[PDB]
């Protein structure tokens, strides 16, 4: 049991390292996809950007 436990300790250490790095790579993958989507979206912004002063849609009178 002691021999098995020594081997298992080594294996579990390596596995913990691999698991952490794998989860972080998955995180990075998702964030890079989000960045690609944002890069495509920024092309649809009109020239000069948005008029952040006014409402985009004016949906009623102001009398």
């Amino acid at each position: 049991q002691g021999i098995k436990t020594v081997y298992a300790s080594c294996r579990y250490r390596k596995l913990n390292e691999r698991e952490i790095i794998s989860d972080r790579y998955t995180w990075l993958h998702e964030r890079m996809l989000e960045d690609e989507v944002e890069r495509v979206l920024l092309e649809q912004v009109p020239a000069g950007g948005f008029d952040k002063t006014r409402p985009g849609l004016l949906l009623g009178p102001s009398t």
Partner: protein, 52 residues
Amino acid sequence: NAFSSFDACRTGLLKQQSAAVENSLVRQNMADVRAKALFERRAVLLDLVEGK
């Protein structure tokens, strides 16, 4: 075929918002005019009131 229904519900909501603003404005203005008239009526009645 689905975008049509979506756009329809969308434009319906927009029309609802516009109509709500217009109707609320009209109602508000009517109420304020009525209140002003009541105030002037009170003013003349206080000019006519009598006693001490």
